[PDB]
Design a protein around this motif. Sequence first.
Motif, mmCIF file in Angstrom:
data_model
loop_
_atom_site.group_PDB
_atom_site.id
_atom_site.type_symbol
_atom_site.label_atom_id
_atom_site.label_comp_id
_atom_site.label_asym_id
_atom_site.label_seq_id
_atom_site.Cartn_x
_atom_site.Cartn_y
_atom_site.Cartn_z
ATOM 1 N N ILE A 89 -18.036 22.072 -0.655
ATOM 2 C CA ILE A 89 -18.169 23.406 -0.910
ATOM 3 C C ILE A 89 -18.287 24.249 0.577
ATOM 4 N N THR A 90 -16.969 24.945 0.836
ATOM 5 C CA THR A 90 -16.771 25.587 1.979
ATOM 6 C C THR A 90 -16.673 27.138 1.945
ATOM 7 N N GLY A 91 -17.059 27.568 3.393
ATOM 8 C CA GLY A 91 -16.659 29.148 3.542
ATOM 9 C C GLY A 91 -17.860 30.079 3.496
ATOM 10 N N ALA A 92 -19.236 29.209 3.665
ATOM 11 C CA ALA A 92 -20.465 29.673 3.753
ATOM 12 C C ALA A 92 -21.064 30.012 5.119
ATOM 13 N N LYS A 93 -21.551 31.188 5.244
ATOM 14 C CA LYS A 93 -22.018 31.462 6.628
ATOM 15 C C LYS A 93 -23.580 31.591 6.468
ATOM 16 N N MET A 94 -24.264 31.281 5.317
ATOM 17 C CA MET A 94 -25.582 31.018 5.071
ATOM 18 C C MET A 94 -25.787 29.774 4.298
ATOM 19 N N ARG A 95 -26.735 28.810 4.346
ATOM 20 C CA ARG A 95 -26.799 27.766 3.267
ATOM 21 C C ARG A 95 -26.952 28.113 2.084
ATOM 22 N N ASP A 96 -27.732 29.388 1.928
ATOM 23 C CA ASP A 96 -28.056 29.630 0.428
ATOM 24 C C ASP A 96 -26.513 29.801 -0.455
ATOM 25 N N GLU A 97 -25.777 30.402 0.289
ATOM 26 C CA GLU A 97 -24.258 30.711 -0.363
ATOM 27 C C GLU A 97 -23.835 29.211 -1.067
ATOM 28 N N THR A 98 -23.970 28.350 -0.156
ATOM 29 C CA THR A 98 -23.534 26.941 -0.402
ATOM 30 C C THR A 98 -24.295 26.558 -1.621
ATOM 31 N N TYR A 99 -25.693 26.515 -1.594
ATOM 32 C CA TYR A 99 -26.576 26.143 -2.616
ATOM 33 C C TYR A 99 -26.130 27.084 -4.001
ATOM 34 N N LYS A 100 -25.902 28.408 -4.034
ATOM 35 C CA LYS A 100 -25.739 29.261 -4.953
ATOM 36 C C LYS A 100 -24.465 28.968 -5.745
ATOM 37 N N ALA A 101 -23.366 28.774 -4.726
ATOM 38 C CA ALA A 101 -21.837 28.502 -5.392
ATOM 39 C C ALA A 101 -22.182 27.228 -6.052
ATOM 40 N N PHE A 102 -22.757 26.274 -5.679
ATOM 41 C CA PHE A 102 -22.860 24.962 -6.433
ATOM 42 C C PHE A 102 -23.660 25.186 -7.829
ATOM 43 N N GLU A 103 -24.589 25.756 -7.708
ATOM 44 C CA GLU A 103 -25.656 26.088 -8.931
ATOM 45 C C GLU A 103 -24.706 26.938 -9.845
ATOM 46 N N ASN A 104 -23.911 27.652 -9.546
ATOM 47 C CA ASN A 104 -23.018 28.425 -10.294
ATOM 48 C C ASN A 104 -21.921 27.621 -11.244
ATOM 49 N N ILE A 105 -21.394 26.715 -10.261
ATOM 50 C CA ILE A 105 -20.166 25.721 -10.762
ATOM 51 C C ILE A 105 -20.767 24.687 -11.637
ATOM 52 N N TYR A 106 -22.038 24.255 -11.459
ATOM 53 C CA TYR A 106 -22.657 23.288 -12.164
ATOM 54 C C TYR A 106 -22.721 23.136 -13.576
ATOM 55 N N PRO A 107 -22.958 24.317 -14.390
ATOM 56 C CA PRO A 107 -22.787 24.220 -15.729
ATOM 57 C C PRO A 107 -21.463 24.220 -16.132
ATOM 58 N N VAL A 108 -20.489 24.617 -15.524
ATOM 59 C CA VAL A 108 -18.838 24.715 -15.638
ATOM 60 C C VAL A 108 -18.415 23.373 -15.505
ATOM 61 N N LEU A 109 -19.024 22.429 -14.638
ATOM 62 C CA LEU A 109 -18.710 21.120 -14.511
ATOM 63 C C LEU A 109 -18.931 20.367 -15.559
ATOM 64 N N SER A 110 -20.310 20.788 -16.112
ATOM 65 C CA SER A 110 -20.899 19.848 -17.295
ATOM 66 C C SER A 110 -20.043 20.357 -18.339
ATOM 67 N N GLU A 111 -19.568 21.533 -18.301
ATOM 68 C CA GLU A 111 -18.830 22.104 -19.457
ATOM 69 C C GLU A 111 -17.510 21.297 -19.574
ATOM 70 N N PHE A 112 -16.897 20.847 -18.467
ATOM 71 C CA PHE A 112 -15.751 20.236 -18.401
ATOM 72 C C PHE A 112 -15.714 18.632 -17.952
ATOM 73 N N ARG A 113 -17.072 18.038 -18.698
ATOM 74 C CA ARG A 113 -17.235 16.592 -18.239
ATOM 75 C C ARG A 113 -16.292 15.860 -18.923
ATOM 76 N N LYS A 114 -15.731 14.809 -18.206
ATOM 77 C CA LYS A 114 -14.667 13.930 -18.974
ATOM 78 C C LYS A 114 -15.254 12.878 -19.562
ATOM 79 N N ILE A 115 -14.980 12.618 -20.933
ATOM 80 C CA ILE A 115 -15.756 11.868 -21.764
ATOM 81 C C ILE A 115 -14.855 10.740 -22.339
#
Length: 187
Positions: free
Chosen positions: A161-187
């Motif tokens: 995760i890159t491009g953040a100026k505040m660590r919270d952005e890094t955290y939020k970007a990851f929290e945002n993407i997490y359900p999406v990654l789950s949605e596309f988990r390779k089974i």
Amino acid sequence: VDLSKHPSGIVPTLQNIVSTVNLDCKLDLKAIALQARNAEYNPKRFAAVIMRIREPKTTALIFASGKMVCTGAKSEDFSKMAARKYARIVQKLGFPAKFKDFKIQNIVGSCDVKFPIRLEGLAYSHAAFSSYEPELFPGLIYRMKVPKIVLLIFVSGKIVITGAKMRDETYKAFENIYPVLSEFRKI
DNA sequence: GCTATAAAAGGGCA
DNA sequence: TGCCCTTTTATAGC
């Protein structure tokens, strides 16, 4: 991990911090490269003196203008701390070095969701944010709009995760993407 | 290595 | 006027 700030239960590890500071005085790069033992200067290649310290492990780009770029630190505090060490080395070299407008410019973090991802599918469903040319680079480039952050998603479940100026952005970007990654988990 | 990503600094050159 | 270039770092295939 505090499940309350990080619902996924995964906290991105900070890997690189880029900061800048204004020494607020003109510098003689040639004199600096000559006196400073752990400093290199090749103007024909780049107009900055490249200097490094072991702790915090970082690399500085020092400019004739007195402006400076600090890279490599693992935290924002380590970056500032490193920037200050360089400003003192420059002070001790005989320049009236101050510490003006220190600013964290970029924060790079990474984590592992520990499950593989169907990049092709995520790319298809999130086309307005994705770039995936596996023959080019194996990771899918996901340019998130809110926060405006860029994530490199790999099939292995490893994420950058890159491009953040505040660590919270890094955290939020990851929290945002997490359900999406789950949605596309390779089974 | 090197493909790609973010970001800053400032000199060179089209 | 405005891109490349340099540096850093995780990631993974060439």
